[PDB]
């Protein structure tokens, strides 16, 4: 009698877990939706009778697996549950890190800022969730399309013996070598060098 939500997905980036869905075709009136999460006891409600096409599930434990379901409701009748399973540590997207770049003669100092988890704190970032975090840097001379890779040991690195007065663009991403999982790349930051070699 009532159509279920369509294309039910979990958009999770840096443990900001947004259950998105598309409203099905309905001609009687404006639909509403109710999303639930399976807590340890029973399906608890998160969004009740909202008019939005999304619900926030960032409050989930982010340890272990969670079961999420949503249905569409009109008046007293309601649709069937569309149920997905979400594992935050494995299904969340690792966002781009920050990158502060400084020019020093033929060298190029770049510091990497961790991707931040909104519902946590400065002392617990994406770098602290995964035990084998390592940054992954990629650079090239602007206009050459010849990428070079470097894996820094920590959150700082120096690119030495570069060409003088040449613009280089740099990117950084998270990476997990235990699973070979890569995070998203940072936006390319391009900076020009100066002169002389030490």
């Amino acid at each position: 009698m009532v159509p279920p939500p369509e294309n039910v997905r979990m958009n999770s980036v840096n443990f900001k877990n947004i259950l998105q869905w598309e409203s099905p075709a309905f001609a009687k009136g404006q639909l509403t939706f109710t999303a639930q999460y399976l807590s340890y006891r029973i399906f608890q409600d998160k969004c009740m009778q909202t008019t939005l096409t999304e619900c926030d599930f960032s409050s989930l434990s982010k340890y272990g697996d969670h079961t999420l379901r949503v249905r569409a409701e009109f008046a007293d009748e309601h649709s069937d549950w569309v149920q997905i399973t979400f594992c935050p540590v494995d299904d969340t997207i690792i966002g781009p890190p920050g990158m502060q770049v400084e020019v020093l003669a033929d060298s190029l100092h770049m510091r990497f800022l961790a991707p931040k988890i909104e519902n946590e704190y400065e002392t617990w970032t994406m770098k602290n969730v995964y035990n084998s975090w390592t940054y992954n840097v990629q650079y090239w001379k602007q206009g050459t399309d010849e990428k070079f890779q470097i894996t820094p040991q920590y959150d700082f690195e120096v690119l030495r013996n570069l060409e003088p007065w040449t613009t280089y663009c740099v990117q950084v991403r998270g990476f997990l070598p235990d699973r070979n999982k890569a995070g998203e790349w940072s936006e390319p930051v391009c900076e020009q060098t100066t002169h002389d070699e030490t």
Partner: protein, 151 residues
């Protein structure tokens, strides 16, 4: 087996556990707590076992804790409003812990944990695992997750 991630738990999870311990302490004072032949805390430290035996001791303490607090959330639904998210997490850790595992001090410890629910009152066990809750999470789990670095 990869429990090394549990050296540093997410602070929001610890805030959820802290609300649980504060909620359990309010219920334990009105119940008949403090029974004879106490088990927590254990007199010896986990560093006094071999690295491969430490998860075995931690598993038996965590399984008891999970078994007791699950029975506590089913006894008091109002108290289970706070215990729900902790229970989910303790279960997941226990699952990850059992993946690292195939008459000394470990035999007698595993024995007393196994012969305690059948010979102790519920409010006592509830109080016993409540005060041991952050001993398990902050010290014992940390030691086991640190592998050969805990010494």
């Amino acid at each position: 087996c990869h429990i090394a991630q549990f050296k540093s738990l997410s602070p929001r999870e610890l805030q959820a556990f802290k609300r649980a311990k504060d909620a359990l302490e309010e219920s334990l004072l009105l119940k008949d707590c403090k029974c004879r032949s106490r088990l927590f805390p254990r007199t010896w430290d986990l560093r006094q076992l071999q690295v491969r035996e430490r998860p075995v001791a931690l598993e038996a303490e965590l399984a008891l804790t999970l078994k007791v607090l699950d029975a506590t959330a089913d006894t008091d639904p109002a108290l289970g409003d706070v215990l729900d998210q902790p229970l989910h997490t303790l279960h997941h850790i226990l699952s990850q812990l059992r993946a690292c595992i195939q008459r000394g001090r470990l035999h007698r410890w595993l024995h007393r944990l196994q012969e305690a629910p059948k010979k102790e009152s519920p409010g006592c066990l509830e109080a016993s695992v409540t005060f041991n809750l952050f001993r398990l999470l902050a010290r014992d789990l940390n030691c086991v997750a640190s592998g050969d670095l805990c010494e």
